[PDB]
Design a protein around this motif. Structure first.
Motif, PDB file in Angstrom:
ATOM      1  N   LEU B  23       0.830  -1.198   0.000  1.00  0.00           N
ATOM      2  CA  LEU B  23       0.000   0.000   0.000  1.00  0.00           C
ATOM      3  C   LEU B  23       0.864   1.247   0.000  1.00  0.00           C
ATOM      4  N   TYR B  24       1.899   1.259   0.835  1.00  0.00           N
ATOM      5  CA  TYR B  24       2.786   2.417   0.871  1.00  0.00           C
ATOM      6  C   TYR B  24       3.390   2.680  -0.500  1.00  0.00           C
ATOM      7  N   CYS B  25       4.017   1.662  -1.084  1.00  0.00           N
ATOM      8  CA  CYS B  25       4.776   1.869  -2.311  1.00  0.00           C
ATOM      9  C   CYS B  25       3.859   2.188  -3.485  1.00  0.00           C
ATOM     10  N   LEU B  26       2.769   1.438  -3.634  1.00  0.00           N
ATOM     11  CA  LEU B  26       1.807   1.725  -4.686  1.00  0.00           C
ATOM     12  C   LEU B  26       1.147   3.073  -4.474  1.00  0.00           C
ATOM     13  N   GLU B  27       1.054   3.512  -3.222  1.00  0.00           N
ATOM     14  CA  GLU B  27       0.368   4.759  -2.939  1.00  0.00           C
ATOM     15  C   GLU B  27       1.112   5.920  -3.576  1.00  0.00           C
ATOM     16  N   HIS B  28       2.436   5.897  -3.498  1.00  0.00           N
ATOM     17  CA  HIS B  28       3.261   6.835  -4.240  1.00  0.00           C
ATOM     18  C   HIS B  28       3.487   6.381  -5.669  1.00  0.00           C
ATOM     19  N   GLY B  29       2.968   5.219  -6.040  1.00  0.00           N
ATOM     20  CA  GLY B  29       3.274   4.654  -7.329  1.00  0.00           C
ATOM     21  C   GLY B  29       4.607   3.959  -7.387  1.00  0.00           C
ATOM     22  N   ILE B  30       5.286   3.820  -6.252  1.00  0.00           N
ATOM     23  CA  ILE B  30       6.571   3.137  -6.227  1.00  0.00           C
ATOM     24  C   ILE B  30       6.344   1.662  -6.510  1.00  0.00           C
ATOM     25  N   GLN B  31       6.692   1.237  -7.708  1.00  0.00           N
ATOM     26  CA  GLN B  31       6.744  -0.160  -8.089  1.00  0.00           C
ATOM     27  C   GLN B  31       8.120  -0.712  -7.768  1.00  0.00           C
ATOM     28  N   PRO B  32       8.287  -2.034  -7.795  1.00  0.00           N
ATOM     29  CA  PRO B  32       9.647  -2.572  -7.661  1.00  0.00           C
ATOM     30  C   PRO B  32      10.596  -1.992  -8.692  1.00  0.00           C
ATOM     31  N   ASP B  33      10.102  -1.714  -9.900  1.00  0.00           N
ATOM     32  CA  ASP B  33      10.905  -1.131 -10.963  1.00  0.00           C
ATOM     33  C   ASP B  33      10.546   0.310 -11.279  1.00  0.00           C
ATOM     34  N   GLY B  34       9.451   0.824 -10.723  1.00  0.00           N
ATOM     35  CA  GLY B  34       8.945   2.115 -11.153  1.00  0.00           C
ATOM     36  C   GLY B  34       9.993   3.204 -11.056  1.00  0.00           C
ATOM     37  N   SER B 237      -4.353   4.677   6.573  1.00  0.00           N
ATOM     38  CA  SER B 237      -5.120   5.855   6.971  1.00  0.00           C
ATOM     39  C   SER B 237      -4.439   6.594   8.110  1.00  0.00           C
ATOM     40  N   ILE B 238      -4.028   5.869   9.148  1.00  0.00           N
ATOM     41  CA  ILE B 238      -3.447   6.555  10.298  1.00  0.00           C
ATOM     42  C   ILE B 238      -2.089   7.145   9.951  1.00  0.00           C
ATOM     43  N   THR B 239      -1.272   6.413   9.209  1.00  0.00           N
ATOM     44  CA  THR B 239       0.014   6.952   8.807  1.00  0.00           C
ATOM     45  C   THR B 239      -0.112   8.059   7.778  1.00  0.00           C
ATOM     46  N   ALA B 240      -1.312   8.280   7.235  1.00  0.00           N
ATOM     47  CA  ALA B 240      -1.449   9.095   6.030  1.00  0.00           C
ATOM     48  C   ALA B 240      -0.899  10.502   6.226  1.00  0.00           C
ATOM     49  N   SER B 241      -1.200  11.127   7.366  1.00  0.00           N
ATOM     50  CA  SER B 241      -0.745  12.491   7.605  1.00  0.00           C
ATOM     51  C   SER B 241       0.770  12.586   7.475  1.00  0.00           C
ATOM     52  N   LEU B 242       1.489  11.858   8.323  1.00  0.00           N
ATOM     53  CA  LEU B 242       2.941  11.819   8.222  1.00  0.00           C
ATOM     54  C   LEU B 242       3.397  11.382   6.843  1.00  0.00           C
ATOM     55  N   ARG B 243       2.830  10.296   6.340  1.00  0.00           N
ATOM     56  CA  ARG B 243       3.497   9.604   5.253  1.00  0.00           C
ATOM     57  C   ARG B 243       3.405  10.376   3.942  1.00  0.00           C
ATOM     58  N   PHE B 244       2.239  10.933   3.621  1.00  0.00           N
ATOM     59  CA  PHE B 244       2.063  11.508   2.291  1.00  0.00           C
ATOM     60  C   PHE B 244       2.694  12.887   2.143  1.00  0.00           C
ATOM     61  N   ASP B 245       2.157  13.896   2.818  1.00  0.00           N
ATOM     62  CA  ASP B 245       2.763  15.226   2.767  1.00  0.00           C
ATOM     63  C   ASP B 245       2.117  16.115   3.825  1.00  0.00           C
ATOM     64  N   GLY B 246       2.433  17.407   3.764  1.00  0.00           N
ATOM     65  CA  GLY B 246       2.139  18.308   4.870  1.00  0.00           C
ATOM     66  C   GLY B 246       0.650  18.485   5.105  1.00  0.00           C
ATOM     67  N   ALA B 247       0.252  18.407   6.367  1.00  0.00           N
ATOM     68  CA  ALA B 247      -1.120  18.591   6.830  1.00  0.00           C
ATOM     69  C   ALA B 247      -1.070  18.670   8.352  1.00  0.00           C
ATOM     70  N   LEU B 248      -2.226  18.531   8.987  1.00  0.00           N
ATOM     71  CA  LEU B 248      -2.284  18.332  10.425  1.00  0.00           C
ATOM     72  C   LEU B 248      -1.699  16.965  10.797  1.00  0.00           C
ATOM     73  N   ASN B 249      -1.439  16.770  12.094  1.00  0.00           N
ATOM     74  CA  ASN B 249      -0.767  15.567  12.607  1.00  0.00           C
ATOM     75  C   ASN B 249       0.546  15.303  11.880  1.00  0.00           C
ATOM     76  N   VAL B 250       1.383  16.337  11.818  1.00  0.00           N
ATOM     77  CA  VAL B 250       2.666  16.222  11.133  1.00  0.00           C
ATOM     78  C   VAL B 250       3.537  15.174  11.802  1.00  0.00           C
ATOM     79  N   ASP B 251       3.701  15.268  13.114  1.00  0.00           N
ATOM     80  CA  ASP B 251       4.804  14.598  13.782  1.00  0.00           C
ATOM     81  C   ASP B 251       4.324  13.545  14.768  1.00  0.00           C
ATOM     82  N   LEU B 252       5.204  12.572  15.013  1.00  0.00           N
ATOM     83  CA  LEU B 252       4.958  11.616  16.081  1.00  0.00           C
ATOM     84  C   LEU B 252       4.881  12.324  17.421  1.00  0.00           C
TER      85      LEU B 252
END
Ligand SMILES: COc1ccc(C[C@@H]2NC(=O)/C=C\C[C@@H]([C@H](C)[C@H]3O[C@@H]3c3ccccc3)OC(=O)[C@H](CC(C)C)OC(=O)[C@H](C)CNC2=O)cc1Cl
Ligand SMILES: Nc1nc2c(ncn2[C@@H]2O[C@H](COP(=O)(O)OP(=O)(O)OP(=O)(O)O)[C@@H](O)[C@H]2O)c(=O)[nH]1
Ligand SMILES: Nc1nc2c(ncn2[C@@H]2O[C@H](COP(=O)(O)OP(=O)(O)O)[C@@H](O)[C@H]2O)c(=O)[nH]1
Lengths: 429, 436
Positions: B23-34, B237-252
């Motif tokens: 989910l993480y890698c495909l979410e950014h479109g990161i394929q094994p070869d992408g 979903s829970i990691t989404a704030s941190l993982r994708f880009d800037g929004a609320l719930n930036v930091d641990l």
């Protein structure tokens, strides 16, 4: 996973082990000379547990054929799967070991346990990881309770870390050639309980009772009985030969099933009661099977489940059948009579299913239980032995070989302590 | 632009890891070869996506994470699979024998044997990092190599990095998938030495999640590839704030501070009401409002409890694309119905809402599919007392008669610590029933 060592002694374990191995090697389907006969790779995924590659990538098991009557070698080679065993683990005494302890327990064969320990060590070295020991014998007479228990002493001395499993055979007045058995029995448990991990009370008494009452054979020879036992133990092994949710493993099997460090007398059973019939006959269905799991006739030990509360319950299922419905049935059985399952442990029952059907029938189950109910067997041994001992009998034999009487008294005390402990643990809340 | 560290302990912690990282890698479109359309071919990144990936001379973005498993089963599958190639080479560690449903083996016989190699890998990989916020760990309760290894590892890590943090995503026991009955013993025997080092934890009760998948996902056999996909969506979903880009719930740190009312009590419930049947074409239509309109029901939470019978501390959210904060505040007006909401007198209340603009990217053909919107409530509600209470009930029932005690006692720890840990959790539940 790791590797295990298989041990068979006496006559029941020597011949009964042969039939068991036949059954399993056929269902896993490897050629007697080791050509790959299996028809799916899932078969060979774990088969390294009990089979090892030869010099030409060819399966050779890891088993040890021990006995002291020289006739066992030919009787084993005369079975269907008698040849394939390793032609260096046939370590046999030639002077006979008539059913009397302390001739093998103390006098001789203590000379030979060094040899068997050497060979088992050199066998297990190449085993990349060692997982434990698989010992099959009969709690009856000399060999099977003599050499076997001494071997247990030695292996527990040398390999404390791994686990130890026993398949136990209890004789009974119905089919009992000899007479001195109860002496041997109590003499054997008094070492087993303090030197094993978990047990398998594969009773002859009720098992003959099945062969003669409902299975309707008035002449149950060593043919039929090995049939039933090979079926049962092979089923017990399948939870391991397969992958599954409850991928119960030796250590895990213990720790899930052993509540207290002593009371490990299991009560294996089998729901599709069978003859050596050329036909499966009896269609068996799962709602019926679940009910059959607790059937008194079904069990391989002399006890009433209804009269007993289970310390732990384990079940294994086979074939292509719906998983969900079974669970529904299990919840149902637990609900109607709460007492049968012990109050101390919640959710004792554990259920897993295996893809391949047992070779012979369509869909069945293989019980592995442990109630306090196991005490009935030990009570029959208690009564019989204490009756035969209130006055002396044959005691000169054991005594003159180097025994005493205090050992007998302490063994009987140990036994009655065990049965008292079971009785107490089935009456708390 | 703030790195972190991920970790997966046991065969349960590695499975969740596997179902999530696609989910993480495909979410950014990161394929094994992408080619990862936002790069520079050498360390190109440093957006929030790369905050978890280190790039080699090939611009590979190999995860800064490990899989840990003494009994080799799932890890062997990872090695055969393309996922190991995607992961940093040799970072992962393979063992030889598990403790098998007994915390002490992974804490007094087996875990210590390889724990040093584990922490060595941790240190070597970590010093490649500069901006780590803390630790993201995956484990659950079952054995000493899945619950005890965690305890020991937290001990070592908290010693080594006094400044850093660690977030817990743990899996709670359930009777329905019982692969032991020592499990409650494991859970207590860990959590009694986890609070002292952990600071923020997440329990996703498979019991409730099983209830979800059986009913409303139309899968009738809960395979360890159904629940895991759903739970992996929870993690995204829970990691989404941190993982994708800037929004609320930036930091641990931000997680802690907006969910901790007290250093001890750091158990936040997670919520994810918006769900879909399957790859099934069409069932109905649904907008941004209705989903939080139905985020109240007690049966839409990752852990069985009645939030109506408790009071909250703070409640963040996320939303996916399709921005309309006006209707969000309209939802804020609607939620005043108070029929399932109530707060605390002294502390100010915030229904903090942050936005991210990515529709939910997922696996090609799993038990789920495309939708337009969702929102996840992170309530550190005091109502989690119910689960601890039930677990205590079961624990006391099994411990009245010294069950299995030897299977721990002879393994290198004494007996009495059972009693002190039981009273420890008794103190914790006292703290719940007091708060309010
Ligand atoms: C449990 O109940 C509640 C909990 C929290 C809240 C409000 C909640 N929290 C606070 O405790 C606010 C201030 C103090 C301080 C705490 C006490 C000390 O770490 C501080 C610190 C020190 C140096 C550098 C950075 C931070 O935190 C923060 O500085 C962080 C900002 C960072 C972490 C994103 O906090 C926020 O402002 C972010 C944007 C999130 N939200 C809040 O506004 C309300 C309730 Cl009811
Ligand atoms: N992946 C996964 N694991 C689950 C799920 N439900 C329960 N488990 C847990 O998976 C665990 C198996 O991993 P461990 O707990 O590490 O088991 P272990 O005996 O300590 O060691 P290993 O079996 O070698 O991992 C059990 O404790 C189960 O409770 C589920 O939905 N997914
Ligand atoms: N051979 C054999 N014996 C069995 C079986 N089931 C029970 N027994 C009993 O086990 C006892 C045989 O003991 P045995 O191992 O021959 O002692 P040994 O003479 O020292 O080898 C007898 O009482 C048999 O009745 C079985 O399936 N096969």
């Amino acid at each position: 996973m790791r590797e295990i060592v298989h041990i068979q002694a006496g006559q029941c374990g020597n011949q009964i082990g042969a039939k068991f191995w036949e059954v399993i090697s056929d269902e896993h389907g490897i050629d007697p000379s080791g050509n790959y006969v299996g028809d799916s790779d899932l078969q060979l995924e774990r088969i390294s547990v009990y089979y090892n590659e030869a010099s030409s990538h060819k399966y050779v098991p890891r088993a040890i054929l021990v006995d002291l009557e020289p006739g066992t070698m030919d009787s084993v080679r005369s079975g269907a799967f008698g040849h394939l065993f390793r032609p260096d683990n046939f370590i046999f005494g030639q002077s006979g070991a008539g059913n009397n302890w302390a001739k093998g327990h103390y006098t001789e064969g203590a000379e030979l346990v060094d040899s068997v320990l050497d060979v088992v060590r050199k066998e297990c070295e190449n085993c990349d990881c060692l997982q434990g020991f698989q010992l099959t014998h009969s709690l009856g007479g000399g060999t099977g309770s003599g050499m076997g228990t001494l071997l247990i002493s030695k292996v527990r001395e040398e390999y404390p870390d791994r686990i130890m499993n026993t398949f136990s055979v209890v004789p009974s007045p119905k089919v009992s050639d000899t007479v001195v058995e109860p002496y041997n029995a109590t003499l054997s448990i008094h070492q087993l309980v303090e030197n094993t991990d978990e047990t398998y009370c594969i009773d002859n008494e009720a098992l003959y009772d099945i062969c003669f009452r409902t299975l309707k054979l008035a002449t149950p020879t060593y043919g039929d009985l090995n049939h039933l036992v090979s079926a049962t133990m092979s089923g017990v092994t399948t939870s391991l030969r397969f992958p599954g949710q409850l991928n119960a493993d030796l250590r895990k099997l213990a720790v899930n099933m052993v509540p207290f460090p002593r009371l490990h007398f299991f009560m294996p059973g089998f729901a599709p009661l069978t003859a050596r019939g050329s036909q499966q006959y009896r269609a068996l269905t799962v709602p019926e099977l679940t009910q059959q799991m607790f059937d008194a006739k079904n069990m391989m030990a002399a006890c009433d489940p209804r009269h007993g509360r289970y310390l732990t319950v384990a079940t294994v299922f086979r074939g292509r059948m719906s998983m969900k419905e079974v669970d529904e049935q299990m919840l149902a059985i637990q609900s109607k009579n709460s007492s049968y399952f012990v109050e101390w442990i919640p959710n004792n029952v554990k259920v897993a299913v295996c893809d391949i059907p047992p070779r012979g029938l369509k869909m069945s189950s293989t019980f592995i239980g442990n109630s306090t109910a196991i005490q009935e067997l030990f009570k029959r041994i208690s009564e019989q032995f204490t009756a035969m001992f209130r006055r002396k009998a044959f005691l000169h034999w054991y005594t003159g070989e180097g025994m005493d009487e205090m050992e007998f008294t302490e063994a009987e005390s140990n036994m009655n302590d065990l049965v008292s402990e079971y009785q107490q643990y089935q009456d708390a809340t | 632009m703030r790195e972190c560290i991920s970790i997966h302990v046991g065969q349960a912690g590695v499975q969740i890891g596997n179902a999530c990282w696609e989910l993480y890698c495909l979410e950014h479109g990161i394929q094994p070869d992408g080619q990862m359309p936002s790069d520079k071919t050498i360390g190109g990144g440093d957006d929030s996506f790369n905050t978890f990936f280190s790039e080699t001379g090939a611009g590979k973005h190999v995860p800064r994470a490990v899989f840990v498993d003494l009994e080799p089963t799932v890890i062997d599958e990872v090695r055969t699979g393309t996922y190991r190639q995607l992961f940093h080479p040799e970072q992962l560690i393979t063992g030889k024998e598990d403790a098998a449903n007994n915390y002490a083996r992974g804490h007094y016989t087996i875990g210590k044997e390889i724990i040093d190699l584990v922490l060595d890998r941790i240190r070597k990989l970590a010093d490649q990092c500069t901006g780590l916020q803390g630790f993201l760990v995956f484990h659950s309760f079952g054995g000493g190599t899945g619950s005890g290894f965690t305890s020991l590892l937290m001990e070592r890590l908290s010693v080594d990095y006094g400044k850093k943090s660690k977030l817990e995503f743990s899996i709670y026991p359930a009777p329905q998938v019982s692969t032991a009955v020592v499990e409650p013993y494991n859970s207590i025997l860990t959590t009694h030495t986890t609070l002292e080092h952990s600071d923020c934890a997440f329990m996703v009760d498979n019991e409730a999640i099983y209830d979800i998948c059986r009913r409303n996902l139309d899968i009738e056999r809960p395979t360890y590839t159904n629940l895991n996909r759903l739970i992996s969506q929870i993690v995204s979903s829970i990691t989404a704030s941190l993982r994708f880009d800037g929004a609320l719930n930036v930091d641990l740190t931000e997680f802690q501070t907006n969910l901790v009312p007290y250093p001890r009590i750091h158990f936040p419930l997670a919520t994810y009401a918006p769900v879909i049947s399957a790859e099934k074409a069409y069932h109905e239509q649904l907008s941004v409002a209705e989903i939080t309109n139905a985020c109240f029901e007690p049966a839409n939470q990752m852990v069985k409890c009645d939030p109506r019978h408790g009071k909250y501390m703070a409640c963040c959210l996320l939303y996916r694309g399709d921005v309309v904060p006006k209707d969000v505040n309209a939802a804020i007006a609607t939620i005043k119905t108070k029929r399932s909401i109530q707060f605390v007198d002294w502390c100010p209340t915030g229904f903090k809402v942050g936005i991210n603009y990515q529709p939910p990217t997922v696996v090609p053909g799993g038990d789920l599919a495309k939708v337009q919107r969702a929102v996840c409530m992170l309530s550190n509600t005091t109502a989690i007392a119910e689960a601890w209470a039930r677990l205590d009930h079961k624990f006391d029932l099994m411990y009245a008669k010294r069950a299995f005690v030897h299977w721990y006692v002879g393994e290198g720890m004494e007996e009495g610590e059972f009693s002190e840990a039981r009273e420890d959790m008794a103190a914790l539940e006292k703290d719940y029933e007091e708060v309010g």
